[PDB]
Amino acid sequence: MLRKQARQRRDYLYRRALLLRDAEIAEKRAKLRAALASGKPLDPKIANDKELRKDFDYDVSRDIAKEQGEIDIDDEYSELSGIVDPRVLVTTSRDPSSRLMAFSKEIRLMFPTAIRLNRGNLILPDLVMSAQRERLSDIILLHEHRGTPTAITISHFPHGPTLMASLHNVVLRADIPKSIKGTVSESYPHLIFEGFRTPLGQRVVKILKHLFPPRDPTNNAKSGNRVITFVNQDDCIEVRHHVYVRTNYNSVELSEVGPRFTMRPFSITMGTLENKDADVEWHLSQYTRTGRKKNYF
């Protein structure tokens, strides 16, 4: 099986490089299709590239289908997007403290298809092996400072990306009294996102919203009573977990039930949790001259 996962990872990276080359070509093919239906004159290299003419007559249809959005991009999520329910486990670091254990239980309650596993003495390659063995969608680590969490590592499987993010301003579920809080309602939640426009922001939105089960589309606009919000300002994505009831047609009442984070992503690696040598995709560029002026996501 591990042979199969290695083979698929290598073939996916090779198809990525092939898509890079073919997109460098198909930037030039699309000018030919647009100049055809319009009549505006085009560049002579485009007009006299004969191999481009043969290949264009072959492969018109995929560009048009991409324009109509009928087809999806070669991605780690478009294979199993909304067909299966992506189950996810949360663990702590090696020696968990009691507050980190309660916090992991809080976010295991936040994701409705999550299970929590104790680390104990569980070597991290055996963790990745067991996850790929039981077909888990995603894995989550947590690192405490002293009873307060500081880092998540959202890792997708079998070979997807990881997002390593630092946490601040966290308030745990397990500090308010049980007379005021209660058992959190486990329902399939809606998700709202705000501020993401770049391709990197879209990548983060995808690898975040592919941790939640897909919702039934027949009456999703009206039913459902629990929403999870991710807003970003100056690339520190802040997340709350609300549960709401709609007292009218023109007013709603909120009630904050989950933890609050302002997680700031400091790495996204194209390669899973065990692969420290995986090719990075974005990391928090500090110690440069303008790494604090530039705003990603």
């Binding site: 009294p177 009442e253 009630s255 904050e256």
Partner: protein, 83 residues
């Protein structure tokens, strides 16, 4: 009880969410408060506005719960840091 169910129970007691009453029911009500009630409901059902201890007091002493507003305190200290 859960947060959602307790909130719905409190609003049905407050009459803000109940079934669509008839004109006869509106007459009965106009024959026979909610502001302070609703402010208490929002204060009690958004409990992360203020830092609270779960254990309660360590030693019970009887004589005659919020323990600080971190958002309000941060806004006030930031205004002082401004000025």
């Amino acid at each position: 009880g859960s947060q959602l169910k307790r909130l719905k129970a409190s609003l049905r007691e407050q009459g803000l969410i109940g079934p669509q009453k008839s004109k006869k029911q509106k007459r009965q009500n106009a024959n026979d408060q909610k502001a302070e009630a609703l402010k208490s409901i929002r204060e009690q059902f958004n409990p992360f506005q203020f830092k609270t201890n779960a254990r309660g007091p360590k030693f019970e002493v009887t004589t005659n719960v919020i323990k600080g507003r971190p958002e309000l305190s941060r806004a006030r200290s930031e205004e002082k840091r401004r000025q």
